[PDB]
């Protein structure tokens, strides 16, 4: 059987997870994808709105 | 806003890994099988000619439910001048589409 | 100049916060969902991603939203209603190549690029990954300079009054009146390419300020007056931030950085507006010393 979700890999976020895909429930045929990446010592969380 | 990690299913782990391999093949990405529950996938950009890699990992989150995890691989991919991050998001949106 | 030397010895990367969020729009996105997402996410600009060409092609800003609101309003008066369903790509076609900067580029380069291209949003794009990392602004840069530049040696012009330096704009100040409809303001914004308009009274005294930032509050009704639209004032408002001609550059830079607004209204003893002094003016001045 498949490994159990590590904490602190959160299943849901409400508003070590670096590079992980998060996404909103789809609505109006538009997809919202999210993830945090690292450039040297700087972090950015990118949201892509995509039909 | 409510953000969800990857995607969820209540199929059998084996069934699940079956469909993502099929979904992958459909896109014509190359993939490697590390574990029975861990896939490294590679893809060459038709426009930029660069390569982007990512991991698909299946976890158990429930007694009935499993979670497919997408993670970009920070390996000197990708763009381009594309965008490793954006191209990551696109590889995913495509797979999540073929599924569903 | 110490300002010039500092700028040339620092990379843009030094200006990026440890942690930030970035909102990107696929160009096929519908304009109306794009602008709602700016509001929802609390951001003033978004990089635009052309999936077909697989690269960033431009930026979506409030100025765009305003252009679009203005067109929409006029077209409606003549029964044309096409702009709502417009994807971003089609509205761009209806009418500015992407200007960006490497994290390894100098802060001096950042400043010049903003001035020379007359923009306000400089995306820092890594040429290796191709990722946009941060959107750099006048405010961010001027705060950084103030913080990281030693107070002495202090150039002598820092102690010179506005009057002497002549920094800012002192002729043809676009202004609105308390009783001015928001759609009228749009016309002025679109025509004068100016970031904010002083709200004055019968005798020309400033009593408020109507920014471009105060307009997207509406993507979350263009008939109300300017005064009315500034009642949904979301942040605590001490009043209008101003300055006099006798005040020194240093005092004005300090006010600006601590206040964290894009400009001061130059005014006299009577609160009559005599000019505007913007972050653009100041940075331009520090870069030509
Ligand atoms: N980095 C950029 N590259 C290319 N075009 C840009 C860039 N930034 C802005 N623009 C374009 O230039 C025009 C003016 O943009 P500007 O940056 O002045 O908008 P803004 O910052 O939202 O307005 P303001 O700062 O005055 O409130 C807009 O139509 C915008 O699309
Ligand atoms: N001189 C001023 N006096 C009083 N209030 C001001 C003044 N300038 C701006 N404000 C208010 O402060 C808010 C911030 O506006 P401003 O455009 O300066 O910041 P911003 O657009 O968010 O950042 P940026 O400088 O990067 O554009 C606006 O709602 C505006 O009404
Ligand atoms: N209401 C206004 N009327 C005339 N000029 C302005 C006004 N607001 C800003 N400016 C000038 O326009 C230029 C760009 O400023 P800003 O749009 O504030 O970044 C600067 O030289 C400002 O002095």
């Amino acid at each position: 059987s498949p490994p159990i979700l590590p904490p602190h890999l959160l299943q849901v976020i409400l508003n070590v997870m670096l590079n992980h895909l998060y996404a909103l429930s789809i609505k109006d045929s538009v997809m919202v994808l999210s993830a945090t990446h690292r450039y040297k010592k700087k972090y950015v969380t990118t949201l892509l709105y995509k039909p | 806003a409510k953000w969800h990690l990857g995607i969820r299913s209540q199929s059998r782990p084996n069934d699940i890994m079956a469909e993502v391999c099929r979904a992958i093949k459909q896109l014509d990405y190359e993939w490697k099988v590390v574990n029975p529950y861990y896939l490294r996938v590679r893809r060459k950009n038709p426009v930029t000619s660069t390569f982007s890699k990512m991991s698909l990992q299946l976890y158990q989150v429930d007694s009935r439910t499993y979670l497919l995890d997408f993670r970009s691989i920070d390996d000197g991919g990708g763009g381009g001048g594309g965008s490793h991050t954006i191209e990551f998001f696109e590889m995913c949106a495509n797979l999540i589409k073929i599924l569903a | 100049s110490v300002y010039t030397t500092f700028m040339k010895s620092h990379r843009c990367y030094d200006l990026i916060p440890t942690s930030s969020k970035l909102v990107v729009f696929d160009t096929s996105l519908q304009v109306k969902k794009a602008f709602f997402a700016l509001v929802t996410n609390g951001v003033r600009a978004a990089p635009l991603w052309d999936s077909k060409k697989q690269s960033f092609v431009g930026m979506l800003t409030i100025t765009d939203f305003i252009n679009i609101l203005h067109r929409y309003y006029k077209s409606a008066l003549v029964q044309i209603y096409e702009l709502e369903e417009h994807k971003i790509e089609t509205w761009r076609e209806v009418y500015k190549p992407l200007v960006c900067i490497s994290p390894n580029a100098s802060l001096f380069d950042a400043v010049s690029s903003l001035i020379r291209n007359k923009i306000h949003r400089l995306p820092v794009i890594d040429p290796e990954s191709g990722n946009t990392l941060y959107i750099l602004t006048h405010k961010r840069i001027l705060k950084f300079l103030k913080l990281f530049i030693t107070e002495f040696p202090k150039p002598e012009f820092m102690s010179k009054s506005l009057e002497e330096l002549q920094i800012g704009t002192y002729a043809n100040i676009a202004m609105v009146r308390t009783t001015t409809p928001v759609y009228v303001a749009l016309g002025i914004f679109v025509q004068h390419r100016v970031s904010a308009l002083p709200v004055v009274d019968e005798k020309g005294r400033v009593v408020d300020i109507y920014s471009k930032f105060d307009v997207i509050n509406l993507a979350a009704n263009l008939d109300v007056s300017v005064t009315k639209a500034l009642q949904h004032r979301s942040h605590y408002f001490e009043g209008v931030l101003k300055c006099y001609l006798h005040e020194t550059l240093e005092a004005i830079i300090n006010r600006l950085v601590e206040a964290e607004v894009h400009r001061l209204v130059v005014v006299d003893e009577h609160d009559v507006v005599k000019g505007i002094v913007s972050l653009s003016d100041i940075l331009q001045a520090l870069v030509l010393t």
Side-chain angles (χ1 to χ4, degrees):
Chain A
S1 46
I4 69 97
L5 203 57
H8 315 73
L9 228 206
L10 298 184
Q11 274 188 96
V12 170
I13 314 297
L14 257 166
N15 297 311
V16 79
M17 2 203 53
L18 281 155
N19 287 33
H20 289 279
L21 180 80
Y22 286 86
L24 292 182
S25 305
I26 297 191
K27 177 180 180 180
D28 299 358
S29 322
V30 41
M31 187 166 342
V32 181
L33 307 112
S34 201
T36 298
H37 297 80
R38 207 196 68 220
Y39 178 89
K40 298 188 176 176
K41 301 257 284 188
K42 300 293 158 72
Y43 302 82
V44 81
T45 303
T46 312
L47 284 68
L48 174 58
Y49 286 72
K50 181 185 186 171
Chain B
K2 214 204 258 171
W3 295 99
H4 293 96
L5 184 72
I7 64 180
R8 294 149 61 83
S9 176
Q10 294 197 311
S11 286
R12 306 176 184 106
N14 288 330
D15 288 83
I16 289 171
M17 303 302 291
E19 212 198 340
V20 339
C21 274
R22 283 187 241 112
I24 291 178
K25 305 175 73 173
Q26 172 163 344
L27 268 10
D28 217 81
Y29 300 2
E30 311 156 74
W31 72 100
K32 204 168 181 181
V33 194
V34 190
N35 316 339
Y37 302 115
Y38 176 20
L39 298 184
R40 240 120 55 178
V41 304
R42 183 135 113 321
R43 192 280 271 117
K44 194 195 173 195
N45 198 321
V47 173
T48 67
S49 298
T50 66
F51 283 98
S52 277
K53 272 185 169 179
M54 77 179 176
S55 300
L56 278 359
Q57 171 84 52
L58 190 72
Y59 294 97
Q60 187 166 8
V61 300
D62 236 10
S63 49
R64 292 199 67 208
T65 319
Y66 312 80
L67 183 320
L68 182 60
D69 177 46
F70 300 73
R71 197 180 197 184
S72 61
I73 301 177
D74 225 65
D75 69 351
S83 176
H84 188 263
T85 295
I86 307 303
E87 305 185 32
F88 169 54
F89 289 157
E90 284 184 329
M91 288 196 295
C92 291
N94 292 345
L95 266 176
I96 298 171
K97 183 203 200 67
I98 304 323
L99 296 171
Chain C
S1 166
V2 205
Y3 280 103
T4 268
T5 285
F6 183 94
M7 295 189 219
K8 304 181 177 179
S9 33
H10 291 91
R11 306 176 181 266
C12 295
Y13 168 88
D14 304 334
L15 294 261
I16 309 178
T18 296
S19 163
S20 48
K21 54 138 52 167
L22 187 81
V23 167
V24 176
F25 293 142
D26 185 282
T27 61
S28 72
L29 226 206
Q30 277 173 22
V31 134
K32 187 153 184 176
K33 303 177 163 57
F35 285 122
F36 184 77
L38 284 190
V39 180
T40 297
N41 288 279
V43 89
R44 279 210 42 158
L48 304 179
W49 174 259
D50 191 306
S51 197
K52 273 299 176 61
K53 316 189 190 115
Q54 289 283 293
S55 67
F56 298 100
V57 292
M59 297 279 300
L60 211 60
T61 75
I62 315 302
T63 286
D64 298 325
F65 177 61
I66 276 147
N67 293 331
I68 298 185
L69 277 200
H70 186 243
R71 255 283 171 55
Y72 158 89
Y73 170 77
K74 298 290 227 174
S75 307
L77 290 175
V78 93
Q79 297 83 50
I80 288 145
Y81 317 101
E82 55 171 48
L83 309 80
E84 305 315 310
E85 295 52 57
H86 268 22
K87 50 208 49 170
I88 300 172
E89 163 159 29
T90 52
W91 209 91
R92 274 169 59 88
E93 206 178 349
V94 160
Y95 290 29
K96 284 286 171 300
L98 171 70
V99 13
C100 60
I101 188 160
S102 165
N104 296 308
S106 111
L107 176 45
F108 181 88
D109 294 355
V111 180
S112 349
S113 200
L114 290 160
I115 281 89
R116 170 185 54 264
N117 292 283
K118 306 202 202 62
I119 57 183
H120 286 97
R121 316 289 155 174
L122 192 58
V124 181
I125 306 200
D126 179 19
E128 286 165 90
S129 66
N131 297 145
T132 299
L133 300 177
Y134 184 66
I135 296 150
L136 204 48
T137 62
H138 290 91
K139 199 177 292 183
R140 183 66 172 184
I141 298 172
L142 188 74
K143 189 183 187 176
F144 193 86
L145 293 170
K146 164 60 175 177
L147 283 180
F148 289 96
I149 289 200
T150 268
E151 188 197 359
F152 305 89
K154 161 150 32 181
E156 262 150 11
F157 69 86
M158 284 298 288
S159 316
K160 259 130 149 183
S161 79
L162 270 180
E163 187 60 48
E164 312 173 49
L165 296 161
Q166 290 174 104
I167 293 176
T169 301
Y170 301 88
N172 303 129
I173 297 326
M175 316 188 291
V176 299
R177 289 174 73 124
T178 304
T179 79
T180 295
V182 169
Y183 68 87
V184 166
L186 291 192
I188 298 169
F189 277 129
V190 166
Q191 168 124 49
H192 288 245
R193 334 251 158 70
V194 117
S195 58
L197 314 163
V199 188
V200 308
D201 59 24
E202 35 203 14
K203 330 181 63 185
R205 298 180 307 237
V206 75
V207 316
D208 213 328
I209 185 93
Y210 192 78
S211 192
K212 275 182 179 185
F213 169 66
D214 295 308
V215 182
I216 50 167
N217 302 174
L218 288 30
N221 273 358
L222 327 171
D223 284 271
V224 323
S225 73
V226 151
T227 314
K228 174 136 298 169
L230 288 162
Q231 295 187 152
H232 281 71
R233 188 72 78 162
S234 297
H235 250 75
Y236 164 93
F237 191 71
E238 265 275 18
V240 56
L241 314 176
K242 45 178 88 92
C243 69
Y244 314 83
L245 286 169
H246 78 261
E247 300 192 281
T248 74
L249 223 201
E250 173 174 22
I252 285 147
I253 291 187
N254 294 339
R255 184 163 311 143
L256 234 16
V257 170
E258 295 164 4
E260 293 192 336
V261 301
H262 190 84
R263 95 287 304 151
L264 308 189
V265 185
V266 196
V267 115
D268 70 355
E269 327 87 46
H270 315 308
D271 282 283
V272 172
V273 354
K274 319 264 80 184
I276 303 288
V277 52
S278 167
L279 297 179
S280 315
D281 308 302
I282 298 159
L283 282 194
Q284 183 177 44
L286 307 183
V287 89
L288 305 174
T289 83

